[PDB]
Amino acid sequence: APLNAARPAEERAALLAWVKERLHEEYGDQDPTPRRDPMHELISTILSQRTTHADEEAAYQELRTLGDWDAITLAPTDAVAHAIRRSNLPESKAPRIQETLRRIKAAPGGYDLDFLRDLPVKDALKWLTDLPGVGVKTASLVLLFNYARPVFPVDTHVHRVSTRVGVIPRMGEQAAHRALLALLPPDPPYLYELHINFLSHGRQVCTWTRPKCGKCILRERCDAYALYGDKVPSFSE
Ligand code: SF4
Ligand SMILES: [Mg+2]
Ligand SMILES: [Mg+2]
């Protein structure tokens, strides 16, 4: 009996579409994501590096008390750093934010990313990942959620469930963005449902430590259960 992770890409894509159908029945069109507007999502991410959810939201809203975006680009970095002080090491985050805002204003349009809509996917991605503090996961999130482009953001929840099941072998999170997208159709609503359903399943069942495999709708095709049964270890390295 071969593990899922060693199976051909075509077999692993059939597996992932089965996974998506099962998660759709457990969770439907349920959405545990922030669903923010583009500028909010981008800046939030920068503030949300080595930082809890409650502290990032607090850091974002106090940031926005400095003024609108144009005011934050011009506010002295001392003021920006003190406002976001409840996030991860505000000294480093404050310049990345200012520079990101600066580079967005210079783009065609106001503090808005209307051009990412009708741009080649690879090019839209590369433009966001060139912004300081923005990685492929945040760029994929903004492109999928706000502009309905066919990209698939892979957060820790998505990465953990998909790896444990064996839809992909173990690899870095950035490499997993290309690997899973390669198994998926260019169908933005499909990708967004798949994403939010992974978040629900990772938060509720396939948890970082002690997953609840006995309540898991995927257990019968899960590599991790096949290997460890009731003793699936914490998602490591
Ligand atoms: S069987 Fe366990 S490890 Fe596998 S997907 Fe379900 S909860 Fe995660
Ligand atoms: Mg602009
Ligand atoms: Mg970057």
Residue numbers in the entry: 19 to 255
What did the original publication write about this model?
Endonuclease III (EndoIII) is a ubiquitous bifunctional DNA glycosylase belonging to the helix-hairpin-helix (HhH)-GDP superfamily of DNA glycosylases. It is active for a broad range of oxidized pyrimidine lesions, removing numerous forms of modified thymine and cytosine bases from DNA, such as thymine glycol (Tg), a major stable oxidative modification of thymine, via the Base Excision Repair (BER) pathway.
In DrEndoIII1 we substituted Arg61 and Tyr100 in DIL1 and DIL2 with the equivalent residues found in DrEndoIII2 (Glu and Leu). DrEndoIII1 Y100L shows more compromised activity when compared with wild-type and DrEndoIII1 R61Q. Our results demonstrate that the affinity of the DrEndoIII1 mutants for the substrates (with THF:G mispair and C:G pair) is reduced when compared with the wild-type enzyme. Additionally, the DrEndoIII1 R61Q and Y100L crystal structures include two magnesium ions, and the DrEndoIII3 G250T/N251H crystal structure has two chloride ions.
